Amino acid sequence: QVQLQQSGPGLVKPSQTLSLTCAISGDSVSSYNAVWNWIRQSPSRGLEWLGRTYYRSGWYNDYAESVKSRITINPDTSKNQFSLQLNSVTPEDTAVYYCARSGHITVFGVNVDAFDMWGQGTMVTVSSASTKGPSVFPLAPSSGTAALGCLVKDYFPEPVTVSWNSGALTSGVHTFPAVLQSSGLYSLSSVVTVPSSSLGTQTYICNVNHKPSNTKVDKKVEPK
C-alpha cells in the first residue's frame, strides 16, 4: 500500500514561511488516479482542508479560500514528493499538518474524494521563542507492582516522544500530555508499571526524542 512520510521544521516565526514536504512511496505524485492534499487540525478549528495538487495531462492546484493568498503546493517529480508553503504565518496557523491522498478509491469505477491514506502529521508551532531541548530526570521506583518513569522538563516547541527500552517495553506505559509551564516551556512525564521482582534483573531506559532540537537522550532509571 501507499506510505506518506512528512518532514520539515515544526517551529516558524510569526510573519515567516512554513515549509513542509510529503514523500510518497507506493504511488506516483503524477498518477492519474491520485490527488495529493494538505489538511491541518487544531483543537479549536478541528479538521481543515488547505489545498491540493494533481496531474491530468498537466498540473492543477486548488486552495481553500482561507489560505489562498498565502499558500503554494508544488509537486517534485524527481523525488516523488509534494510540498506545502504557507507565507506570512500567524498564531492561528499553529496546528498539526497532514498530507493525504484522495481520489484513488473507487465506487462503481468512479474515483472518490475520500482521504484513504494520511501521513503521520507534523506539529507546527508559530512562535518567536527559540528551540530548547529537554532535561530528562528519573522517577525512581522506591520501597507487587512498581512504578517508574522519566520527567522530561523544559523544552520547546512540542512534541517530544518517549519510548522504553528502545520500544521493547510497551505494556503498562503512560506518556502524559505535555503541560505549558509559566516559563513558556513544556514539560511531561512518562511512566511504566512493572513487576517489582524485575527491578534487580531488568534494566529500564527511557528513550527521549525531541526532533526540533535534534535531541535524543537515553536515561537509565534505577532504584533508590
Binding site: 500500500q1 478541528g46 479538521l47 481543515e48 482542508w49 481553500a64 497532514y98 478509491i105 465506487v107 472518490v112 474524494d113 475520500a114 482521504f115 484513504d116 491514506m117 494520511w118 501521513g119 503521520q120 502529521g121 532535561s135 530526570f137 528519573p138 522517577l139 525512581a140 522506591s142 507492582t145 512504578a147 518513569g149 520527567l151 522538563k153 503512560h174 506518556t175 502524559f176 500530555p177 505535555a178 503541560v179 509551564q181 514539560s187 511531561l188 512525564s189 511512566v191 508499571t193 533508590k224
Partner: protein, 209 residues
C-alpha cells in the same frame, strides 16, 4: 458551500452497546459522505467511504447508512479499542467530530509518589510527582501537603486519554518548588480522593529517607 453537522458531540457507552452517530449535510446533492476514526496521537484513518463501504482493514461491526441529507455511522457492538473521535466528510468539508467514550465499572487508582532526583536538585528546582494509575471514572481530587500544609497554585495535572484495552485513565500531578523551599521541609504527601476508594489515600516520603 457544503456544511456538515455531527450529533452528538460526544457520548459514553458500554462495551457491547450499539452506538449510532449522525451527520447532516446542507447545500450538497452528493451522497458521498466518508467517515474517519482518529485515535489519540494518530492520524485519522478512513473508516467508511461513499456512505456505506467499509475501508481497508475495517471490521464488520462498523457500518454506514445514508438517506438524502442524513448519514449515520453505526458500531454494532462497541469495543474498548473503538475509543476515538469520529469525523464525517464531504468534498473539502469535515464535520466537527463525535468523541466516543467507553463506560465501564469503577476502578480505584494505584497511587505512587516520586521525590525529585538529586540531579534535578542541582539545577535549583525540585519537581515532586504524584501518579494515579489506571482508574475510572475520570473525576479525582489530588491534594499536596508539605509538612502538613495544604499547597495551592504550585502544581499542574495532566491526564491520559482512555486506555484502548482497559478503558481507564491515568493522571499525574506535579508540584514544583525551588530547591531552597524543597530543602526547608521534610514530609511530602500526595492525598487522593476517588469514588473507587473507601476513604482518601495518602502516599508520602520524608526528604533524605
Amino acid at each position: 458551500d457544503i456544511q456538515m453537522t455531527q450529533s452528538p458531540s460526544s457520548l459514553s457507552a458500554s462495551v457491547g452497546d450499539r452506538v449510532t452517530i449522525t451527520c447532516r449535510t446542507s447545500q450538497s446533492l452528493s451522497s458521498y459522505t466518508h467517515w474517519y476514526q482518529q485515535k489519540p496521537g494518530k492520524a485519522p484513518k478512513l473508516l467508511i467511504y461513499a456512505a456505506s463501504s467499509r475501508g481497508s482493514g475495517v471490521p464488520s461491526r462498523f457500518s454506514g447508512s445514508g438517506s438524502g441529507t442524513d448519514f449515520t455511522l453505526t458500531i454494532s457492538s462497541l469495543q474498548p479499542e473503538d475509543f476515538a473521535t469520529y469525523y464525517c466528510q464531504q468534498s473539502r468539508t469535515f464535520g466537527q467530530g463525535t468523541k466516543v467514550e467507553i463506560k465501564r465499572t469503577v476502578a480505584a487508582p494505584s497511587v505512587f509518589i516520586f521525590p525529585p532526583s538529586d540531579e534535578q536538585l542541582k539545577s535549583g528546582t525540585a519537581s515532586v510527582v504524584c501518579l494515579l494509575n489506571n482508574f475510572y471514572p475520570r473525576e479525582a481530587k489530588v491534594q499536596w501537603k508539605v509538612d502538613n500544609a495544604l499547597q495551592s497554585g504550585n502544581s499542574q495535572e495532566s491526564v491520559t486519554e482512555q486506555d484502548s484495552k482497559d478503558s481507564t485513565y491515568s493522571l499525574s500531578s506535579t508540584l514544583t518548588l525551588s530547591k531552597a523551599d524543597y530543602e526547608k521541609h521534610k514530609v511530602y504527601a500526595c492525598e487522593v480522593t476517588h469514588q473507587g476508594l473507601s476513604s482518601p489515600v495518602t502516599k508520602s516520603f520524608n526528604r533524605g529517607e
